Design a protein around this ligand. Structure first.
Ligand SMILES: OCc1nnc2scc(-c3ccccc3)n12
Length: 124
């Protein structure tokens, strides 16, 4: 059984459009999406399809790049830090559910380095 996926809209949450959030979509997310290791992270973890019945027993704050992409497109975030926190939650969940040296962890490690390279400098 899968939980409902994270929300991508919420009417009582205030929205903002900023240069940094536009760059997080155009540059950060859309470039990481194309990496050879992006595919496990492009959609919420489907525990039924992937046969991970313990995934949501361990991961209580799921996050993925599909959700982040919709949140950016739907102007869900207030600021860049809120979006950056969702990328960090996605990487940390991968480390928590797995073990050092696992293939999925090697993938998340490489994507996290690319992510940090791209958010080291943001637009004004
Ligand atoms: O490898 C476990 C795992 N941890 N985080 C993620 S996102 C996708 C997967 C996954 C699972 C099974 C086959 C292929 C990929 N995983």
């Amino acid at each position: 059984m899968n939980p409902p996926p994270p929300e991508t809209s919420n009417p009582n949450k205030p929205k903002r459009q900023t240069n940094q959030l536009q760059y997080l979509l155009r540059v950060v997310l859309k470039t990481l999406w194309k990496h050879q290791f992006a595919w496990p992270f492009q959609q919420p973890v489907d525990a039924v399809k992937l046969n991970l019945p313990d995934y949501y027993k361990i991961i209580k704050t799921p996050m993925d790049m599909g959700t982040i992409k919709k949140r950016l497109e739907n102007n869900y975030y207030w600021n860049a830090q809120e979006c950056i926190q969702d990328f960090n939650t996605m990487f940390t969940n991968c480390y928590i559910y797995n073990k050092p040296g696992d293939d999925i962890v090697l993938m998340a490690e490489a994507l996290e380095k690319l992510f940090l390279q791209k958010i080291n400098e943001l637009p004004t």
